Structure formats: structure tokens, C-alpha cells
Amino acid sequence: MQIFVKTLTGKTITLEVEPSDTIENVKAKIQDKEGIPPDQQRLIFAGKQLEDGRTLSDYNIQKESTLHLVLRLR
């Protein structure tokens, strides 16, 4: 299953995922492609900030969905 992750700089990212993939696994995949540490990542979809422990399936995220990423320093 393919999904997209859009960034603030208009940049877009393509990821290969499964519906059972957790948000944490998705952040790990983003780190692999962009080198961004998971701790700086905030993923947002349909008005909600996604929780690391939940899965894509839990948010009804389907193929071709577009998630938004914003980075924050804790």
C-alpha cells in the first residue's frame, strides 16, 4: 500500500506501508528517506495529530492517502 506524506516546504514523500503499520513504524520509514529523527515528527491527518502506538488502519488511512508532516523540537 502506497501513501504520501506532504511537508511544509511543499515537498512530498512516498512510503510503502501496510494497514497494520503503526504511526511509529511510519515515522521510522520517514527517517530512512529523509534522515529526520522520529522525535521531531508530528504526523497529521483529517484534523488529528496521529499517535505513535496506533496503526494506519486505526485512522482509516487507505492507499494513496496524504498525511501531513510538521517538525517540532521537544
Binding site: 511544509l8 484534523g47 495529530q49 485512522y59 482509516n60 492517502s65 501531513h68 510538521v70
Partner: protein, 140 residues
């Protein structure tokens, strides 16, 4: 039809949020009066750019013959149209024809929302269109 405690609360939370509080209040109250299966609450909406914003949302089940939805009313309503998502809350994810109408951003692609005229449309009409969504094939 609508408890006065709800009417008063509705007027209250709308004032500091909406640019057009009179229209938002009129349209949202009319909606609650027409569809008893819908309820209101405010919740923090997180925008794509990360900005949090407290907004009024209306939620509940709508008949199509049924689907649980969450409708958000943007602070610029009616200049900007409302937006609706299927309400996954408490469902056994092991489940829809409605899915073919959900855009990549997770919103229900209701035609009326893309062909929006802020001077002749309201929230009630939006729900009405949702009730007939399956009568036409998914556009884009």
C-alpha cells in the same frame, strides 16, 4: 426540539471562534433542530500546517437508505464550506461504498462542498446532500 441549555452553550462557544457568528449560530441551530441524531461539541482541530484551532463540530449518524460522521464548521463559515469525515470512533475496524468518496486527505468528497456558494447554501443542505451521496458515482 433543542434543549435551551444546548442553545445557550451553542451561542456561547461560537462568539469567540467565528468571523460570522450570526450565520454560524443560525445554521448550526437549524441543523440540530432538523436532525435529532446530530449533536454538537467543540474540539481542537489540528490543521495541516500544525496549527491547533478550537472549532465547533457536529457529529452523529446520517441515513442514506447509515453512516457515522463528524462535520467541522470552519471559522470562516460560510465564506468557506464545512468538511466531513466518517466517524471511526468505537467501530470494529474489520468493516464501504462510502470509501470511494473519501479523498486522499480523509474527507468525504461531497459534490456540494466543491461547488459551494456562501449565499445560498447552509449546513442543512450539506447533510441532505450527504444522504444522497451514493446516488451518483464518485467524481474525482
Amino acid at each position: 426540539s433543542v434543549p435551551e441549555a444546548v442553545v445557550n452553550w451553542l451561542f456561547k462557544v461560537i462568539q469567540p471562534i467565528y468571523n460570522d457568528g450570526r450565520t454560524t449560530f443560525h445554521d448550526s441551530l437549524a441543523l440540530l433542530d432538523n436532525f435529532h441524531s446530530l449533536r454538537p461539541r467543540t474540539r481542537v482541530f489540528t490543521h495541516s500546517d500544525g496549527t491547533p484551532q478550537l472549532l465547533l463540530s457536529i457529529y452523529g449518524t446520517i441515513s442514506t437508505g447509515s453512516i457515522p460522521v463528524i462535520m467541522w464548521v470552519p471559522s470562516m463559515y460560510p465564506v468557506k464550506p464545512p468538511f466531513i469525515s466518517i466517524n471511526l470512533e468505537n467501530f470494529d475496524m474489520n468493516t464501504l461504498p462510502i470509501q470511494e468518496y473519501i479523498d486522499s486527505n480523509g474527507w468525504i468528497a461531497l459534490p456540494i462542498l466543491h461547488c459551494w456558494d456562501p449565499a445560498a447554501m447552509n449546513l442543512i443542505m450539506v447533510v441532505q446532500e450527504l444522504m444522497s451521496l451514493l446516488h451518483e458515482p464518485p467524481q474525482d
